[PDB]
Amino acid sequence: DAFVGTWKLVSSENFDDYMKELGVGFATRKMGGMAKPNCIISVNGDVITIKTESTLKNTEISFILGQEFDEVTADDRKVKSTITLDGGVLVQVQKWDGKSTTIKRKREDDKLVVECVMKGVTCTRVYERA
Ligand SMILES: Cc1c(Cc2ccccc2)nc(C(C)(C)C)c(-c2nnn[nH]2)c1-c1ccccc1
Helix, strand or coil: CCCCEEEEEEEEECHHHHHHHCCCCHHHHHHHHHCCCEEEEEEECCEEEEEEECCCCCEEEEEECCCCEEEECCCCCEEEEEEEEECCEEEEEEEECCEEEEEEEEEECCEEEEEEEECCEEEEEEEEEC
């Protein structure tokens, strides 16, 4: 859709604070905050795949909209994830240990805009086509 492609991180706001809320420790936050990952999004039938590639860490999730799945996050959390399409926005919720975080991926102009919320912390990451 508007989401399919290869997307390179070009900007990030409040990622260190978000990682802190995720319980990521200092040395790991340092490494994560300088990463400039590629995000490759593809769709085949029901199944959407989101691949993250960086020198620090690669991740991949494949999923069906509305169908909860198990995910190991980049920072090694074991979470229950559910992703839906809401007014053109991919909305992801991860739930683990009575906590949750929400990740919204939207297409705005040339950009893929990713908004991550946990507790009072909102991080916004902007990716552009590679
Ligand atoms: C939480 C998180 C972490 C945690 C982490 C920190 C430090 C070391 C290892 C993990 N790391 C990454 C890197 C840079 C490492 C891939 C991401 C990420 N994925 N796509 N773009 N950025 C996210 C992330 C960002 C937005 C949406 C979903 C996940």
